[PDB]
Amino acid sequence: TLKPLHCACMVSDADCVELLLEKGAEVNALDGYNRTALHYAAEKDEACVEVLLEYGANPNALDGNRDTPLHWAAFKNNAECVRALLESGASVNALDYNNDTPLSWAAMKGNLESVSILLDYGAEVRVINLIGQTPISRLVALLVAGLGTEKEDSCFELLHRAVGHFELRKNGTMPREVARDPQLCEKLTVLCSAPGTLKTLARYAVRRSLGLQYLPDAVKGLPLPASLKEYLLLLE
């Protein structure tokens, strides 16, 4: 099924992958499961990811379901791997067969660090997949199940600041799972019934106009004060 470079990536040894690549190994070779060595490297460690990228590995290689290594780095919550992939030209809004972006997978599990990096690189929060789910919807589904902690709450706050305004109510009623929780239902209805402060909407427009960049570097050149520069990066 898999090939020696894939095994080296799985075992997470940078030396083996580096020496194998040193003899012109086919870096972008598929395998039995239609993955690439970079998929395993992203799933496992950042040293392997860096070694593979140094030797021309494609950062947007697709797999059976059209999932790039960034999808799996975000799902696994390998923040260093996510940053390494994005820094080498990976698509931050790549869509798989289900129209699932890496941010959607990160928010599904409430991965704070990966979500923060993806937003820093311009990930879109106002995105919906084929079955009508959005990153905030999936995070709320995680929260209502009682499996969330302070990290998940911080992730929700980050996504709420990044989105500007969201609406979880189909027709005029919250989903069944949310509706049965009096506290979270009340909180989310209050959030969804507020139009949204002008500052948040302006920040969303500015960020969208900056799309697909290392936003903290881009905002440095803007004529805004320091406080508004910090605001534009979701730091307040």
Partner 1 sequence: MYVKLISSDGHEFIVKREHALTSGTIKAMLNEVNFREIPSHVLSKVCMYFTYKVRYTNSSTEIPEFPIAPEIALELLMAANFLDC
Partner 2 sequence: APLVHATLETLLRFLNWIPLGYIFETKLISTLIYKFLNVPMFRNVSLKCLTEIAGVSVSQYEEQFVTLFTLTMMQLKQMLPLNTNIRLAYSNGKDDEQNFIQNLSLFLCTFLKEHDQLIEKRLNLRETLMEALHYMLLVSEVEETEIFKICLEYWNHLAAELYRESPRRQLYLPMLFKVRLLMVSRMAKPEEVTDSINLYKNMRETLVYLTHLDYVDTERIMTEKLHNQVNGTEWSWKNLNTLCWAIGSISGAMHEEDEKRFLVTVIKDLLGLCEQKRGKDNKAIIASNIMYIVGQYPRFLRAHWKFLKTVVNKLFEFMHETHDGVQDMACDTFIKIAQKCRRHFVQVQVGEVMPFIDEILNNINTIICDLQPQQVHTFYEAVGYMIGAQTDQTVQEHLIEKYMLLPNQVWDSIIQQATKNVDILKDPETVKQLGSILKTNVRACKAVGHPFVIQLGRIYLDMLNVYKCLSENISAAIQANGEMVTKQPLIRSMRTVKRETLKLISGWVSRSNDPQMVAENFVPPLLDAVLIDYQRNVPAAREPEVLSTMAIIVNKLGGHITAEIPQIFDAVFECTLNMINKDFEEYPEHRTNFFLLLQAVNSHCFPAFLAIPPTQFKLVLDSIIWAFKHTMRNVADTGLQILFTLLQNVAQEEAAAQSFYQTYFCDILQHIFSVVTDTSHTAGLTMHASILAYMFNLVEEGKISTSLNPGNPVNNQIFLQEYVANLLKSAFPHLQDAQVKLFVTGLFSLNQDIPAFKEHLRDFLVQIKEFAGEDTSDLFLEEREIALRQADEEKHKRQMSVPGIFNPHEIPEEMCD
Partner 3 sequence: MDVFLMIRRHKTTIFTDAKESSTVFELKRIVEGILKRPPDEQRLYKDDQLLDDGKTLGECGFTSQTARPQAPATVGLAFRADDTFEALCIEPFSSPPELPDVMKPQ
Ligand X SMILES: *[C@H](CC(=O)NNc1cnccn1)n1cnc(-c2cc(C(F)(F)F)cc(C(F)(F)F)c2)n1
Name the helix (H) or strand (E) containing 52. helix 46-54
Question: What are the angstrom distances between the C-alpha of 212 and each of 89, 90, 207, 216?
Answer: 10, 10, 10, 12
> What does the DSSP assignment read for 18-70?
HHHHTTT--TT---TTS--HHHHHHHH-HHHHHHHHHTT--TT---TT---HH
Do 219 and 229 form a contact (C-beta atoms < 8 A)? yes
Q: Does 212 participate in binding ligand X (rule CB under 6 A)?
A: no
Helix (H, G, I), strand (E, B) or coil at 173: strand
Number of residues that bind partner 3 (CB under 8 A): 10
Cβ at position 224, least distance to partner 3 in Å: 11
Q: How far apart are CA 41 and CA 83, in angstroms?
A: 13
125 binds, among partner 1, ligand X, partner 3, none (CB under 5 to 8 A by kind): none
Name the helix (H) or strand (E) containing 189. helix 182-193
Q: Does 98 participate in binding ligand X (rule CB under 6 A)?
A: no
Q: Does 168 participate in binding ligand X (rule CB under 6 A)?
A: no
Residue 148 or 211: the one with the smaller Cβ distance to partner 1 is 211
Q: Does 149 participate in binding ligand X (rule CB under 6 A)?
A: no
x-marked contacts with partner 2 along 69-88 as a string, rule CB under 8 A:
---x--xx------------
**Per CB under 8 A, which region of 64-72, 130-138, 162-170, 220-228 contacts partner 3?**
220-228
Residue 184 or 224: the one with the smaller Cβ distance to partner 1 is 224
Q: Does 29 participate in binding ligand X (rule CB under 6 A)?
A: no
Do 58 and 36 form a contact (C-beta atoms < 8 A)? yes
Helix (H, G, I), strand (E, B) or coil at 80: helix
Number of residues that bind ligand X (CB under 6 A): 3
Residue 85 or 136: the one with the smaller Cβ distance to partner 1 is 136
Helix (H, G, I), strand (E, B) or coil at 170: strand
The encoded tokens of residue 43 equal: 């799933």
User: In the set 7, 168, 206, 228, which binds partner 3 (CB under 8 A)?
Assistant: 206
Length of the chain: 236
Site residues for partner 1 per CB under 8 A:
165, 167, 169, 172, 193-199, 201-203, 205-206, 208-209, 222-224, 227-228, 231-232
Q: How far apart are CA 6 and CA 17, in angstroms?
A: 9
Contacts of partner 2 in 133-162 (CB under 8 A): 142, 144-147, 149
Cβ at position 94, least distance to partner 3 in Å: 16
